Write a protein that binds this DNA or RNA. Sequence first.
RNA 1: GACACCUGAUUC
DNA 2: GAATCAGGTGTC
Lengths: 133, 133
Amino acid sequence: EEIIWESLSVDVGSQGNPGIVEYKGVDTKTGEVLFEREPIPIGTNNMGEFLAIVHGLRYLKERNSRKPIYSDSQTAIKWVKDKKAKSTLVRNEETALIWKLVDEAEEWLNTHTYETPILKWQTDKWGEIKANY
Amino acid sequence: EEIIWESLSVDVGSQGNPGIVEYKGVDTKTGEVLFEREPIPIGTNNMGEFLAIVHGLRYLKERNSRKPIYSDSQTAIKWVKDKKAKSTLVRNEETALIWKLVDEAEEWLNTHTYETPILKWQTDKWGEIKANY
RNA sequence: GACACCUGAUUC
DNA sequence: GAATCAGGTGTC
Ligand SMILES: [Mg+2]
Ligand SMILES: [Mg+2]
Ligand SMILES: [Mg+2]
Ligand SMILES: [Mg+2]
């Protein structure tokens, strides 16, 4: 109910859905961009939302940080929880790159450990998420 | 598409949104101003766009004119089509006047008949609408 | 129902 | 940068 400022905020950005997807992670307190993914040709909002959290996880683990992660995506939070992204995006030559990243994400989620709390950003109370595009 | 010069062009003009709104109708061919609404204290762009078309309709009917009407407003064209303006503007003492006009507009749209074609001005091909402020 | 992502047309 | 509307997609 109270914003935990000592945290990382992620968000996806896109042009079309499915369409070009990118995502980044910033410091919730300052908004400093800590990581940003190079635009992927084709992917869904949710896939991008998902990859943003997994990426955030790896990023905190590499810096031995116990800060939680904020995502406004109800779908991605669950996918991360079950360590399983359940996307409908067709698998083919076009969407080959996003699916690569996605499979890798899940692989990492199963070959690694973390205690990082994954929090739901309450847009309906606090406004847009800090990493919002 | 070919521009139908034998027609009426309407547009809204405002200061803030919501804010002070006004609108006028001109001859598409010459730009002659055929009617102009006295500035309303508070209203939205779309409400002003909507009122501009309905006013245009009454204006053509009174002169027994079958000329079509041009509006660049996707929202207003649909509102006129359903004879129902779906605005979010709060209803209260401040916005009392604009809502009056709007209610009256819809009332007129239901107590009257017309064949007047309502055309979408293709700004992305022809430039600004002739009644543009 | 809910959480998101845009797309488009406008208004400043 | 910020507000007003309509349409369409990805998911729980
Ligand atoms: Mg998001
Ligand atoms: Mg966002
Ligand atoms: Mg207009
Ligand atoms: Mg204009």
